[PDB]
DNA sequence: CGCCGTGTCCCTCTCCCTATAGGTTAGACTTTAAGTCAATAC
C-alpha cells in the first residue's frame, strides 16, 4: 500500500517521503520498518507496514477532496454553541483529529467570525496553525505552491 | 508498693477568555489675571 518513493500523506504533519523499506528488528521479529520523512519538522519516523492504517496514514487529496472541502468552506448556516469556551474546545477536539473536511470548517467557520468579530491572539494562532497545515495540504494536493495555495485559498473565501 | 539519682539524647547558642458597571483623565471651550503701549502732567 505504501511503496518507497512515494509521497504518502501522515497526519499531522502532511505528505512526506519514504526512503526506504527497513528490515529493523526486534525480539528476533524482522518486522517491514518503513523510514518516512517529512520537510518541515525535519524528522523522521520509523512505521510498520502492518499497523500503518492503524496510524492512519491518509493519502494526498485529490479532485474529489479539493471540491469537498470547497463546498465546506462554502456551506453556510454554521452556527455555534453561544459560550465560547464550548466552542473553542470542541474546534480544538475537531482539529485535534485532523480530517481535511474538518480543518476546512474550522478555517472557514474562524474567517467567518475574524471578518467582524475578531479574536484573540491565541484564537489568531490556533487558526494559523489549522491554516498552515491546511494550505500545506492543499500545496502539495493540487501540487501548487504554497505562496499560490494561500492567495487561491484567500480567493475562495470571499467567493 | 512507693518514690528519687544517673545516664543518654535532643535542642539551642556561640565562634484562559467574555460581559457589566463604574471611576479616572485628557482634551477642548470661555473666563481671568497678566503683560503691553500710547498720551500726559508735574
Redesign the pocket.
Known amino acids: 500500500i505504501f511503496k518507497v518513493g512515494d509521497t504518502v500523506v501522515y497526519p499531522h504533519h502532511g505528505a512526506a517521503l519514504v526512503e526506504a523499506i527497513e528490515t529493523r528488528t526486534i525480539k528476533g521479529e524482522q518486522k517491514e520498518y518503513l523510514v518516512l520523512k517529512v520537510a518541515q519538522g525535519d524528522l523522521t519516523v520509523r512505521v510498520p507496514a502492518e499497523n500503518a492504517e492503524y496510524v492512519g496514514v491518509r493519502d494526498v487529496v485529490g479532485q474529489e477532496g479539493l471540491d469537498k472541502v470547497f463546498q465546506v468552506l462554502r456551506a453556510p448556516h454554521t452556527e455555534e454553541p453561544t459560550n465560547?469556551?464550548r466552542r473553542?474546545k470542541a474546534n480544538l477536539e475537531k482539529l485535534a483529529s485532523g480530517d481535511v473536511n474538518k480543518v476546512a470548517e474550522v478555517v472557514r467557520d474562524l474567517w467567518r467570525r475574524d471578518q467582524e468579530?475578531?479574536?484573540?491572539?491565541?484564537?489568531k494562532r490556533m487558526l494559523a496553525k489549522a491554516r498552515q497545515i491546511l494550505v500545506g495540504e492543499l500545496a502539495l494536493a493540487e501540487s501548487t505552491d504554497d505562496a499560490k495555495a494561500e492567495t487561491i485559498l484567500d480567493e475562495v473565501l470571499a467567493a
Request: aromatic share 20%.
Open positions: 465560547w469556551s473553542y468579530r475578531g479574536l484573540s491572539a491565541g484564537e
